[PDB]
C-alpha cells in the first residue's frame, strides 16, 4: 500500500511468492495510476534471466490499475537478494501506447521525471 506521486503500488515493500494450482510460484504487483495522465511504466529486476514479468513495459490510464504477474522460470527459486524496480513517468495526453511509442518515450523523458519504486522478495 505505497502511495507515490504517480502510482500507488501494492505491495509496498515486500513481495510474497505463493504456489499456484499448477505448482508454480507467482506474485502480483498492482500499479494504480493516481494522476490524470497516462503513466508509462517499466519493470526491471536484479536477476533478468530469472523472472517472467508480465507485462514489463506498458502504460496505465488515469485512475486505472494494472496487474504485473511475476514468476521464476521453472527450476529456479526466489532468493532474498532478488529485487524489483518500478519506473514510471507521465505521458502526453495524445501519445500512443504501442511498443514503439513506449520505447521512444523512454528515450526522450528526462531523468528527473522518472519515478522509481523498489521492491524486495520475501523468502524466510
Amino acid at each position: 500500500v505505497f502511495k507515490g506521486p504517480l502510482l500507488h503500488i501494492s505491495p509496498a515493500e515486500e513481495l510474497y511468492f505463493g504456489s499456484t494450482e499448477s505448482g508454480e510460484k507467482k506474485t502480483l504487483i498492482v500499479l494504480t495510476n493516481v494522476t490524470k495522465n497516462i503513466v508509462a511504466f517499466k519493470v526491471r529486476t536484479t536477476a533478468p534471466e530469472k523472472y517472467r514479468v508480465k507485462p514489463s513495459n506498458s502504460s496505465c490510464d488515469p485512475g486505472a490499475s494494472v496487474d504485473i504477474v511475476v514468476s521464476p522460470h521453472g527450476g529456479l527459486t526466489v532468493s532474498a537478494q532478488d529485487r524489483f524496480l518500478i519506473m514510471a513517468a507521465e505521458m502526453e495526453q495524445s501519445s500512443g501506447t504501442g511498443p514503439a511509442e513506449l520505447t521512444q518515450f523512454w528515450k526522450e523523458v528526462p531523468r528527473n521525471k522518472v519515478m522509481e519504486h523498489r521492491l524486495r522478495c520475501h523468502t524466510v
Binding site: 519493470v43 526491471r44 533478468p48 517472467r52 507485462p55
Partner: peptide, 10 residues
C-alpha cells in the same frame, strides 16, 4: 544493478 527482463508489452 537493475535490468530489463525479456520484453513483454500489451
Amino acid at each position: 544493478q537493475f535490468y530489463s527482463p525479456p520484453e513483454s508489452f500489451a
